């Protein structure tokens, strides 16, 4: 087995009050990649967030409310690294990576880009910087699993009424083109769309009860994995959890097992 959980909690505190800690504790998994901690590493040090039988790793942004990402693993990773050299990355700890034998996973959290124009500019900046870094991450032997919420949909199949969202951030032409270039040209794939080419599957919908009723979801979570692991995809699922997190948990299993 080889499970991976992705829950952009948008605040580990709200996650705790919503019962995310108990759900993850009950949810038997190998690695858990929650995003947007909205708290300092010292806050994550609170044993309440420490899941029984899992390690604690977290990198906080310069400003807690800005972001922050954490990573829980069942076995001691070979090494944990944070940052990518970019200001938009280092100054906010939006990237944290653990190292295991043969495969090393990472936790990515892109800026929403929907708050303001400056957020969209930062999004474009981080996108170009990240595709550059990944170009530098081509011939690298170690296979990767960039588990992160990219705040962008690849195809219309990933979001309904695209006609209305075409101009709204998250589905704009340049972001979709960047994602397509990152996926196809560079040989990267996705476990879900590979194992299950089924529409209507989303992760992030408005907290508004109306959108939840009519299910206005935007697929923002993606299990970006190097082509080496593409062959070892078991199955993907997007549970419709009752408002536990804006980004619904993204659980995927893999045929390839892990090792220290």
């Amino acid at each position: 087995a080889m499970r991976i959980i992705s829950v952009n909690v948008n605040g580990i505190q709200a996650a705790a009050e919503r019962g995310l800690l108990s759900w993850l504790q009950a949810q038997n998994a190998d690695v858990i990649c929650l995003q947007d901690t909205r708290a300092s590493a010292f806050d994550l040090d609170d044993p309440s967030f420490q899941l029984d039988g899992y390690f604690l790793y977290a990198c906080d942004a310069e400003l807690p409310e800005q972001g922050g990402v954490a990573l829980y693993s069942r076995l001691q990773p070979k090494a944990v690294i944070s940052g990518l050299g970019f200001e938009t990355a280092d100054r906010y700890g939006r990237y944290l990576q653990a190292d295991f034998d043969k495969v090393s996973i990472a936790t990515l959290l892109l800026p929403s880009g929907q708050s303001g124009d400056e957020s969209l500019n930062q999004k474009f900046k981080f996108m170009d910087d990240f595709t550059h870094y990944l170009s530098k991450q081509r011939r690298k032997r170690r296979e990767y699993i960039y588990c992160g919420s990219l705040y962008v949909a690849h195809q219309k199949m990933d979001v309904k009424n695209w006609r209305e969202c075409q101009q709204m951030p998250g589905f704009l032409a340049p972001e979709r083109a960047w994602l397509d270039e990152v996926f196809g040209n560079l040989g990267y794939a996705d476990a879900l769309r590979e194992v299950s080419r089924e529409g209507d599957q989303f992760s992030w919908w408005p907290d508004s009860e109306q959108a939840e009723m009519l299910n206005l979801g935007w697929r923002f979570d993606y299990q970006v994995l190097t082509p080496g692991l593409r062959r070892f995809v078991r199955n993907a699922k997007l549970p419709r959890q009752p408002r536990f997190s804006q980004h619904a948990p993204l659980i995927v299993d893999y045929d390839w097992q892990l090792s220290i």
Partner: protein
């Protein structure tokens, strides 16, 4: 003989340098431009000078009509 229709189409795409998107049998989309071709090979110029074997090319979709 074998490429009476493939050869002229590929040669026109090359001369016109139309940005094409090659879809592999594996389903991986490959955007870029056709640099050169032959019997069973096509050179795609992009960020990385790529060589895609014809036997593994499913479809090619030029972005503009030719």
């Amino acid at each position: 003989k074998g490429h009476s229709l493939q050869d002229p189409y590929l040669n026109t795409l090359r001369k016109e340098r139309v940005p094409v998107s090659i879809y592999l049998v594996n389903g991986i989309k490959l955007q870029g431009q056709i640099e050169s071709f032959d019997q069973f090979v096509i050179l795609l110029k992009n960020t990385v000078s790529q060589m895609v074997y014809k036997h593994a090319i499913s479809t090619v979709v030029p972005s503009r009509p030719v």
